[PDB]
Amino acid sequence: PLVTCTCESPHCKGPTCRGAWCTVVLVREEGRHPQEHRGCGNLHRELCRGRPTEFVNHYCCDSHLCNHNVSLVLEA
Amino acid sequence: PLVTCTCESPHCKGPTCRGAWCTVVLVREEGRHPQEHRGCGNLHRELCRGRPTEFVNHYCCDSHLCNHNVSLVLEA
Amino acid sequence: NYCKRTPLYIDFKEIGWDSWIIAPPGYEAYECRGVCNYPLAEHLTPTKHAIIQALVHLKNSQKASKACCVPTKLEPISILYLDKGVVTYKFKYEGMAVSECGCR
Amino acid sequence: NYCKRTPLYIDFKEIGWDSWIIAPPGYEAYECRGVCNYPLAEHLTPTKHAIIQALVHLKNSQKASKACCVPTKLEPISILYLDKGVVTYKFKYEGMAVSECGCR
Ligand code: NI
Ligand code: NI
Ligand code: NI
Ligand code: NI
Ligand code: NI
Ligand code: NI
Ligand code: NI
Ligand code: NI
Ligand code: NI
Ligand code: NI
């Protein structure tokens, strides 16, 4: 079964998306400000289990619109 | 059957190589001087049939060391 | 911009291939250009190594380069080519047109 | 330098994957870095689209970008990972280590 998720990423063809789980990915490159991506996830569920680092944080959930307005924090 | 060819390219693990045909490729990028590559060829024989252009020239032969000290010219 | 399929028309005459490609004069080969910034989107079918390599590039750019946008499935085209002066019809000239891009 | 396979050790702790990867602490994932300058060498198994795209990049860099160095065959590794707190043994974790590079 799938779930509807908030889509706020460059690969979003609409405000919502349907996937196996909802994702919030907080990514920080070496130079610029961290960007917060929201969307769904169907492959590589193991990304959700990664401990937050200084550069990446993976949040995942499978409730309806559970990834909406969820703020993540990176490691120092 | 294969043939021994003169090898003078960055991908040459020795002075000679064994392939279906010997190649001399004269390549010119947009900025720097044209480089002349010598080696063998086993795939994409159709590259040999390409008419010389302002940036590339493909010479091919299947004689023993036939691609040795062969000078190519590009188009204006 | 992000990794996606970009239109790219190849004129066989301007690459010297019209000497043996009788028809067509050219074709839409397409092109996969764009950056593979993390997270690697699923529609680009990123492999686990590409995802890992993208994570190390975030840690520091010196250790690992970023995942690259490359074609993942290629489609054949039909050409008319000279076979020793004879115009012959090849139905599937494999690996010519891009149908799917990805991050590898 | 040219497209080739470069050693790249991944420390699972430094990418946050040690939370679920019990063993090994890391592995040699390798990396395909380097430029795919024309002519595309045959040991990098370049496709016909990659060869064509490399030819248009020589004509002018604005129309088509250069072919990219990417992994072409990936190998699995064996890991010990947590399955709901249980240390389980996965024999083939596919798509983890690079065995062959190429230009696509
Ligand atoms: Ni999992
Ligand atoms: Ni041919
Ligand atoms: Ni696409
Ligand atoms: Ni062209
Ligand atoms: Ni990035
Ligand atoms: Ni994979
Ligand atoms: Ni290699
Ligand atoms: Ni690392
Ligand atoms: Ni080049
Ligand atoms: Ni091909």
Numbering used by the authors:
A (entry chain A), B (entry chain A): 30 to 105
C (entry chain B), D (entry chain B): 321 to 424
Sentences from the study reporting this entry:
Bone morphogenetic proteins (BMPs) are dimeric transforming growth factor β (TGFβ) family cytokines, initiating cellular signalling by forming a complex with two copies of type I receptors and two copies of type II receptors, both of which are type I transmembrane proteins with an intracellular serine/threonine kinase domain. ALK1-mediated endothelial BMP9 and BMP10 signalling plays many important roles in angiogenesis and the maintenance of vascular quiescence. All TGFβ family ligands are synthesised as preproproteins, processed by furin-like proprotein convertase upon secretion.
Secondly, by solving the crystal structure of the BMP10:ALK1 complex and comparing it to published structures, we have identified three regions that are highly conserved between BMP9 and BMP10. The conserved region 1 accounts for ALK1 specificity. The most striking feature in the conserved region 2 is the insertion of a hydrophobic residue, Y416 in BMP9 and F411 in BMP10 (red arrow), located in the top strand of finger 1 (red arrows).
